[PDB]
Each structure stands twice: as C-alpha cells, then as structure tokens.
C-alpha cells in the first residue's frame, strides 16, 4: 500500500550500504597487491641510466655485479656480443704459449741448440752446417777476406782433415830456407873444389 | 504530492545501483589491464639475483643467454665496461700474427736463412757474414784455440783463397825431408872430395 | 512518515557522495600505479622474446655501455662476462710477446745473439766464444767442405792464424826451383876426377 513501498526502500538501500562496504575492501587489497608486485618488479630489475639506454651501470656496489651464463658472443671484426670467461681463457692458453715458444727461442739460441751453428754442451765441438750438404764455406763479407785466427795447429798426416796454421807454415818454410843455405855452401865448396 | 515522491526516490536507487555496477565492471578491467602488464613485464625484465646485486645469472637456460649490441668497453686498466666479440677479435689478430712470426722465427732459423751464417739451399755454400764488414774469424774458445776440421783440401795456386789441410802439408813435408836426405849425402860426399 | 522520506533522501544522499569519493580514489590509484608500470616498461632491459636466449640493447645503432661489471672468472667453459680490464691485462701481455719477437728478429739480424756473433758492422766475427771446446767441424751430410774467402794468415812460430792455397803455391814453387837445382848439382858433382 504506502507503509510498504517505504519498508522496501529501506531495504534496497540497506543493501546498497552494505555492497559499498564490501567492494570498499576487495578494491583497496586489490590495488595494494598490483603496487606491490610493481614495487618487487622495479626492486629487482636491471635497468639503463636514462632515456638516451647509451649506458647500464650495475647496481653491484663498487664490487660490481657478475652477469653470468652469457652465451658464447660471436668473434669478429665488428661484432657487438658480449664474451665470457671462457672465451677470454682461449685466448689466454695461446698468449701463454705464444710466451714460452719465444722463451725457448731465446734460450735454444744461446745453448747453440738450433741453427746452422751448434754445439752439444759448453765442452763439445762446434759444428757448422753439420745436417745439409754443399762443400764449400765462404767467410768473405763486404770488406773482402778474412784472415782465420784462433786456429790451434792442425794433424800432420796423409789424410788429415785438419785446417794448418802460421805456425806450422812456418816449420816449413825454415826447412826450405835450410835447405837454400845448404845449397848455397854446396855451391860454393864445388866452386873452390874447382880451382884446385 | 506524495507518489511522485517514492518513485523519485525508486528512481534514484536504481541509478544507484547502476552505478555502483557500473564501477563493479571499470575496476575489475582497470585491475586486469594492469596486473596483464605487470605479468608481461614480470617476464621480460631482466632481473638481479638477490638484493645484493653482485649478480644477475641469465635466463635462458642451460645454453645461456646472447648479449647484443655492447658498445665497445674502455679497454684500460681495471676498467669495469663489458667488452664485445669485435674488441676480442683485435686482440686475437695480434695473437695468430704473434703465433705465425713465432712458427717463422724458428723455420728460417732452421732452413739458415736469417743470421750471420747462412745458407741458400741444401747444396749451396755456407756463408758466414757475407753482408757485413770486418777482416777476423776468431774460432778460440774460454779454452783457448780451436782445431778446424772437415777442411777438403784447397785449391793450390798464385790467387788461392782456399784453406790448407793436414795431407796437403804431409805431402810438402815429405818432399822437403826427401830434399833434405839428398842434401846430407850430397854435402857428406863433399866431405870425402 | 513524510519524516521517513526525509530519512531515505538523507542517507541517498550520503550513498552518492560516497560513490563520489570512492571515484576519486580509485582514479588516482590507477593512474599512479600505471605511471609506475610505465616507467619501469621504459626502463627496464628485456630479453628479446619468450625463449631468453637473446638480449639486444636498446641504445640504437651505437649501442650500449654496459659498465660496473665484477671481473668474470677466466677459466675454460665460463659463462662470465669480463671486463675491459681483464681484456687490458691480456693485452699487455700480448705486446710484451710482440716486442720480444721483434727484439729477437733484430738481435738475430744485428748478430748480438748465439753461437756465432760480431759486436759492430765492422768488429771481428766471433765463433763460440765464451763456450768451451777444442774442435770447430765443417763437414756436413756431403762430406768435408772448402773453407774459401780465407785471407793470407801470418806466417810465424807462433801464429794462430789459417793458411791458404796461393801461400802453400810459393813453397811448391821452391821445391820445383830447388829440384832443379839439385840437379845441376849432381850433373856437375858426376863430374869428378
Ligand atoms: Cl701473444
């Protein structure tokens, strides 16, 4: 009638207020969950510096921040791949190859262990071209023959091998003038020898 | 006029109710739109490992992750700039060139093609300084002097430029003895005349 | 009565301003948390796609810095990025090798190295001299060797220095002189009475 239409407005708007209280609290925990998963994202992200993204500086402390499993970058000229450790390491084992080869270059040299010139320890012989042929060894340079010192006198005999020195040119050559005097007092005798 | 009234009043809660579902519906797709973002973002950002930031550990898995378009890293001492494929290939260059002059040092050594002793080829002559000055060979040692040997003979002339072995002495020497046994009885035949 | 209409009007009135209020809110939390979300899209790297096995940097044809990166562990298989500075150690380490292959080049060139030197374009040419020994040979795999380019050496009792062939020709020159000689001795000393 008129008492009744007014018991049904009240009622609807009984259940207004409560349906406002009640979306109130799923909204209010509905929008602080999202702000906290934004806030958790943003805490945790990697980001660029700025708008211009020229430049990441990691947020590690002066320690720096390690990023790890990055794929093999590509190595070449003009490439903009980050590299690893790894790739790093490779180059490393051949630098320090590269390093100890000419340590022993250096080292082979002056032991007299390489080379056309060589020599088995600090006692043996030297040798000269001892594993490859030809028959000749020429000491001329640019300012025309060289004289041969140091030389310690050579084997006399029928199939000696043995460079001679001065010295033992010189034994020779006091025989023959030996013997030139000799003929001289021969000629002289055979001479007086005459006259009479 | 006191029914006009009520269905103002009827009037005026259904707009209410309208209302009140029509803001039901924007939350609920303004919540959804953000949350999608978020998720979508959640996805694709990059993270940190911990709060620390000493680390962040790619995720693509067990074959890792590519990094691309680095600009090149200061390359200067304790510089903390990543570095790219482009700046290890320059480094590599000077690696394999150093490697080949290092597998060409040791070769022309043995082939004696670099030094003060040389020679051209297998048949070729030894020689020892030829591009360079001066008028000694010393061949002495910390003990003293030094017997030369595999010497072949020489040429015997007037413009011999030829080193002189033993046998080729042995035979002067022979001669120069014989003369001198002539000589003796020569002279001892003098004696008696 | 009419004093419950008054009533109802009232707390209509209170249900709009309260819809009102809640608007407003909800608007301003929205947008502030779509603010942050985007911020954080435009500043956050990503990985290119779902699978994460690329990142490609956003800095454009130039590329981007990434700096403050903690030396990678270098060792082999290691999935670390490294540094400039760890690139620069390497670096002057690969130098060093560079200059010593050099230096040896030139020393070998300026005959300063080895067994076989000469300190100056125009010193003496030295053979093994600060090593011991008493033999020099110069026979390689085609047998015993010429030694040429030989130099007159002095002729005393106590020389050290090698002979050659045209010194060796004077004395057979002698001994044909003398044989000759010696012949005109014994042609003349037959002749006695
Ligand atoms: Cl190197």
Same mark, same amino acid.
């Given at each position: 009638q008129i008492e009744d239409k007014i018991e049904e407005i009240l009622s609807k708007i009984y259940h207004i207020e409560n349906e406002i209280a009640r979306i109130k609290k799923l909204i209010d925990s509905a929008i602080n969950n999202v702000n906290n998963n934004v806030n958790e994202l943003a805490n945790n992200a990697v980001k660029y510096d700025? %708008?211009?993204?020229?430049k990441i500086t990691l947020?590690?402390? %002066?320690?720096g921040t390690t990023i790890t499993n990055v794929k093999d970058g590509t190595v070449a000229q003009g490439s903009k791949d980050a590299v690893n450790g790894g790739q790093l390491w490779n180059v490393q084992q051949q630098v320090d190859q590269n390093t100890t080869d000419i340590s022993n270059i250096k080292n082979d040299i002056n032991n007299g262990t390489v080379g056309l010139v060589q020599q088995a320890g600090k006692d043996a012989p030297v040798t000269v071209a001892k594993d490859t042929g030809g028959t000749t060894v020429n000491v001329a340079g640019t300012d025309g023959n060289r004289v041969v010192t140091g030389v310690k006198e050579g084997a006399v005999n029928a199939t000696s091998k043995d460079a001679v020195n001065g010295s033992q040119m010189k034994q020779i050559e006091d025989k023959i003038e030996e013997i030139l005097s000799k003929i001289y007092h021969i000629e002289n005798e055979i001479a007086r020898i005459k006259k009479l």
């Open positions: 700025d %708008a211009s993204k020229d947020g590690g402390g %002066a320690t």
